[PDB]
């Protein structure tokens, strides 16, 4: 897997044919994006775009940290699961938010994909809620200090 950056609209096709099928693209077009200091990355096999991670600086009211950042889009093809691509994105991205001195990545994470991020060191905070329509999701964070 290589790991390279990416640009917000590089993440949408992804973001919706894994995370989003069906609604409309638009509803992929997260508006976090949008936020100050957002960023992506992109895993890269045999030529092809197959796994996304964005970040961008959000606190939670509800983990402690001074400076927090928000893991969205985190998804990779199916063909090409298993291969640590994501978890490459994800030690990537800890390399550059702890160069910008972040105390903590949190996600609101699919229950399904929970396992993932507890093999990434992450832990659960307090209860599965839903998320209309992409269903389950749990708080979960890992500290980068
Ligand atoms: C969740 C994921 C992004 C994982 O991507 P990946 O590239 O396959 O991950 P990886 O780095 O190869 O997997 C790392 C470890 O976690 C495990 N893992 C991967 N997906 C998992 C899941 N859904 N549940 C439990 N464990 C999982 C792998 O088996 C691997 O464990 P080992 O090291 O013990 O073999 C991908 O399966 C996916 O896109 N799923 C569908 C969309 C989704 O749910 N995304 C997360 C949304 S959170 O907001």
């Not at 950056?5 to 409309?24: G, K, M, S, V």
């Not at 959000?58 to 985190?74: I, P």
């Not at 702890?98 to 609101?108: I, P, T, V």
């Amino acid at each position: 897997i290589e790991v390279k950056p990416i640009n917000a609209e590089d993440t949408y096709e992804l973001r919706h044919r894994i995370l989003r099928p069906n609604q409309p693209i638009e509803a992929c077009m997260f508006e976090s994006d949008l936020l100050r200091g957002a960023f992506h990355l992109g895993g890269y096999y045999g030529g092809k775009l197959i796994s996304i991670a964005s970040f961008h600086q959000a606190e939670h009211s509800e983990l402690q940290g001074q400076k927090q950042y928000q893991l969205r889009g985190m998804a990779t093809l199916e063909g090409y699961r298993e291969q640590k691509a994501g978890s490459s994105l994800i030690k990537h991205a800890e390399e550059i938010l702890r160069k910008r001195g972040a105390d903590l990545l949190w996600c609101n994470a699919r229950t399904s994909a929970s396992g993932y991020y507890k093999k990434l060191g992450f832990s659960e905070q307090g209860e599965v809620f839903d998320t209309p329509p992409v269903g389950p999701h749990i708080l979960m964070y890992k500290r980068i200090t």
